[PDB]
Amino acid sequence: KPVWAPHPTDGFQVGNIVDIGPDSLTIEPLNQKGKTFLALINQVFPAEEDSKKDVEDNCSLMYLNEATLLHNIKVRYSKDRIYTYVANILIAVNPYFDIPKIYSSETIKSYQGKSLGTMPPHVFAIADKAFRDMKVLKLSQSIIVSGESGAGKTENTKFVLRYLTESYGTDRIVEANPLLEAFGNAKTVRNNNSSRFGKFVEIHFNEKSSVVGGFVSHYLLEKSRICVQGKEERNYHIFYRLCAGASEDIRERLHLSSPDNFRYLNRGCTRYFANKETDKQILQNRKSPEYLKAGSLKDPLLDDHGDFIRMCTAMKKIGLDDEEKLDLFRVVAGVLHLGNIDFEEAGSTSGGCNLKNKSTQALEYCAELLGLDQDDLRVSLTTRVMVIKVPLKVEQANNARDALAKTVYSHLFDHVVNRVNQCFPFETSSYFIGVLDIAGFEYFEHNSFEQFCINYCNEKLQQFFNERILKEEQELYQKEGLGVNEVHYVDNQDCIDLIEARLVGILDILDEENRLPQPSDQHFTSAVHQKHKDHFRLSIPRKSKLAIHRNIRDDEGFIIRHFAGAVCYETTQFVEKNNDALHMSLESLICESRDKFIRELFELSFISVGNKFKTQLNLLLDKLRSTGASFIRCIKPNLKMTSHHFEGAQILSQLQCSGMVSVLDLMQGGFPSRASFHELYNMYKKYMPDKLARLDPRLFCKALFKALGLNEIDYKFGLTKVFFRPGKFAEFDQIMKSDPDHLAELVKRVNHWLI
Numbered sequence: 001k002p003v004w005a006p007h008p009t010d011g012f013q014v015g016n017i018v019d020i021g022p023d024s025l026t027i028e029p030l031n032q033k034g035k036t037f038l039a040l041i042n043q044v045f046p047a048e049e050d051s052k053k054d055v056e057d058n059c060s061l062m063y064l065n066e067a068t069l070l071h072n073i074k075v076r077y078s079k080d081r082i083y084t085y086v087a088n089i090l091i092a093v094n095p096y097f098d099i100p101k102i103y104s105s106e107t108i109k110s111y112q113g114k115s116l117g118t119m120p121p122h123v124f125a126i127a128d129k130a131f132r133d134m135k136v137l138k139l140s141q142s143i144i145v146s147g148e149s150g151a152g153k154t155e156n157t158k159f160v161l162r163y164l165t166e167s168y169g170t171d172r173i174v175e176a177n178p179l180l181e182a183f184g185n186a187k188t189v190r191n192n193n194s195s196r197f198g199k200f201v202e203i204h205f206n207e208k209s210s211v212v213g214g215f216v217s218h219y220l221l222e223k224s225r226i227c228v229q230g231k232e233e234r235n236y237h238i239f240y241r242l243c244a245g246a247s248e249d250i251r252e253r254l255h256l257s258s259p260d261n262f263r264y265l266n267r268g269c270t271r272y273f274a275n276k277e278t279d280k281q282i283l284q285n286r287k288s289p290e291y292l293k294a295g296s297l298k299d300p301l302l303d304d305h306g307d308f309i310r311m312c313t314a315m316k317k318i319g320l321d322d323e324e325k326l327d328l329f330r331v332v333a334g335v336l337h338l339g340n341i342d343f344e345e346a347g348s349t350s351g352g353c354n355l356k357n358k359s360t361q362a363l364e365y366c367a368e369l370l371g372l373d374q375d376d377l378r379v380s381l382t383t384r385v386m387v388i389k390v391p392l393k394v395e396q397a398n399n400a401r402d403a404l405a406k407t408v409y410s411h412l413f414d415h416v417v418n419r420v421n422q423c424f425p426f427e428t429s430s431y432f433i434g435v436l437d438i439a440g441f442e443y444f445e446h447n448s449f450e451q452f453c454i455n456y457c458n459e460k461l462q463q464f465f466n467e468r469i470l471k472e473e474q475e476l477y478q479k480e481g482l483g484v485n486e487v488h489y490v491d492n493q494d495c496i497d498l499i500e501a502r503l504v505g506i507l508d509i510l511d512e513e514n515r516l517p518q519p520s521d522q523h524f525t526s527a528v529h530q531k532h533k534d535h536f537r538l539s540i541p542r543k544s545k546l547a548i549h550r551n552i553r554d555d556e557g558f559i560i561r562h563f564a565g566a567v568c569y570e571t572t573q574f575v576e577k578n579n580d581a582l583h584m585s586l587e588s589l590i591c592e593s594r595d596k597f598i599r600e601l602f603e604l605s606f607i608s609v610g611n612k613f614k615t616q617l618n619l620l621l622d623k624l625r626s627t628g629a630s631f632i633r634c635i636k637p638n639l640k641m642t643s644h645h646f647e648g649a650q651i652l653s654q655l656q657c658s659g660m661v662s663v664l665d666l667m668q669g670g671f672p673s674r675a676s677f678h679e680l681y682n683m684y685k686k687y688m689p690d691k692l693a694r695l696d697p698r699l700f701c702k703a704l705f706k707a708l709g710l711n712e713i714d715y716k717f718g719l720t721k722v723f724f725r726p727g728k729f730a731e732f733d734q735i736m737k738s739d740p741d742h743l744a745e746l747v748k749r750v751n752h753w754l755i
């Protein structure tokens with residue numbers, strides 16, 4: 001009798017239907033006799049009879065729908081059970097605090113070799129199932145960890161890596177994380193430890209299924225962050241870890257000071273993450289005036305001083321020598337000092353510029369740290385070669401300085417990722433388990449090239465999700481004659497082609513612009529609109545429903561009609577953001593550095609960022625399409641980074657946008673485990689007496705399952721394979737186990753049953 005009906009902030013609320021009208025149901029909220037509200041018929045769902053129970057697999061619910069799924073994960077979350085299955089897919093709700101012992105070495109050991117469902121839902125069980133599938137099927141595997149910014153993708157990715165290396169090893173793969181996060185993570189409004197690059201981490205195994213090494217692929221490091229941030233955000237953690245934690249000897253060698261002293265840090269938040277203890281370990285000369293007034297930033301995970309110490313320990317553990325450590329820090333400090341080089345107008349018509357007299361020290365420190373001559377650096381930032389050496393305007397000098405900073409830092413990040421790969425190499429491997437941790441679809445008031453690339457990535461990955469979860473799965477069910485109700489989808493190749501098609505795609509049109517004598521963002525934007533006037537996925541910014549886009553000219557942006565939502569991209573800076581290469585004069589200044597480390601970072605100048613990413617993404621998709629896939633859907637419970645605060649409407653929105661709601665019936669009515677009658681019969685054959693061997697493979701399988709007490713609630717026979725339903729992984733694993741004693745025992749049971 002009680003049903004779930006909409007609620008503005010909780011998503012759904014309990015009530016009883018008291019009336020029906022055209023396209024409406026009248027709902028009486030539970031225990032509020034007399035009070036009523038209207039709800040659309042299609043927005044009212046049946047509720048589970050027992051409101052207090054919780055199930056480990058949502059497929060176990062009598063009435064699985066968006067409302068009962070939300071309630072089940074809510075009840076579990078209230079009891080610190082953050083992990084729940086939907087058959088073999090895992091839902092992980094971010095707790096925003098450390099739940100005691102759930103990631104301990106004892107917990108890790110408890111998950112080893114256990115069938116899904118034998119143990120409580122956990123990220124370790126997804127990792128173990130991928131390992132078991134890898135070993136049994138002799139097929140590499142991918143674990144895709146998805147969700148909103150701050151949902152827990154990076155934390156769950158780290159739990160998977162720790163589980164696999166601790167269980168199936170003979171520590172560097174785990175130890176590499178603090179190093180990569182130092183250079184590629186930063187505080188954003190949505191996450192204090194936001195990943196500003198995407199990654200695919202592979203753990204490689206030998207023929208005995210033991211760890212031999214790893215490989216990290218990195219994507220789209222955010223360059224804009226290097227030079228300026230929003231007042232509540234920070235630059236990359238490394239800058240603050242260095243300022244908070246460096247010894248006075250290092251501070252002096254690098255000419256470091258409190259973060260408020262650097263243009264590249266001082267528009268963002270200049271405070272450190274610290275607690276009462278670590279704040280006393282940070283020296284007074286590292287603290288900005290805002291830190292001394294407002295106090296430290298608080299986080300349960302991050303600690304700038306503590307993290308610097310842990311990073312140095314990680315560097316030692318991985319084999320990074322003390323010399324390489326200082327080489328990395330010198331580049332980081334060189335980029336900070338570069339940012340302090342300021343310019344002033346020069347010329348009777350302000351056509352040129354000069355370094356401000358106050359910037360003399362910054363020029364000196366920067367040149368010293370980057371191994372450059374002060375004069376060549378000053379000249380390269382204030383003039384342009386076209387031979388002919390002409391003055392730059394102040395705005396152009398600021399751009400040249402910032403371009404050099406962004407390129408040096410991005411090359412340093414490429415160096416760090418490569419150095420980490422060199423710490424766990426392998427000459428050969430039989431298979432791998434790869435973990436994908438990349439940002440999904442996102443949009444803000446202002447969307448630029450960074451959002452354009454991430455949303456393009458999302459179109460391609462969404463297509464992979466559709467092809468694997470819906471297309472391939474249902475084609476198997478249909479071919480096998482299973483009669484599973486079909487879930488349809490609309491393919492997005494038209495959106496992918498708009499962005500990436502050769503010659504006509506937006507990325508190619510943008511590259512065309514970078515190669516022109518006088519590149520222009522406006523010329524690029526007009527070329528897109530002119531080429532794609534008939535494309536239903538593209539529109540001018542004036543077509544938008546929002547007031548913020550009313551002033552955007554046709555050549556100043558474009559709208560992409562992604563199925564996830566229409567996004568208006570402002571095209572200013574698309575041409576500059578699309579170039580990974582430095583101008584020839586800055587490139588030569590940096591390639592000719594006195595410092596070997598600097599020359600080694602760099603060992604018409606144009607490298608397409610868009611097409612570099614397209615090639616990388618295609619290599620990633622080649623790997624995903626050729627491996628088995630497991631999915632973890634991370635959920636962010638609130639926008640306040642707080643524990644025990646479940647925002648039902650926000651969580652419901654994520655469950656809907658992720659596509660999880662659209663597949664609930666397909667997963668519940670699906671068959672995640674299967675084997676052919678032939679492979680089963682062939683495995684048992686040698687143990688069979690004649691009476692069993694004489695049976696056709698399908699008939700032997702039927703006798704085996706009946707003897708073991710299995711029924712239609714556990715399995716269904718297809719044309720060539722047996723299929724096991726959700727919540728039947730343990731039963732399937734028993735049938736599949738190839739140990740001679742185990743096979744002989746099951747045959748003994750079948751022989752006894754048959755009599």
Ligand SMILES: Nc1ncnc2c1ncn2[C@@H]1O[C@H](COP(=O)(O)OP(=O)(O)O)[C@@H](O)[C@H]1O
Binds near residue numbers: 098191300301
């Ligand atoms: N299972 C977890 N246990 C403890 N804290 C967690 C857990 N998952 C996430 N967090 C917290 O949430 C923050 C954001 O998680 P994160 O993995 O960085 O998000 P994402 O990578 O999806 O942007 C973490 O820095 C941490 O404070």
Ligand SMILES: [Mg+2]
Binds near residue numbers: 194195
């Ligand atoms: Mg992350």
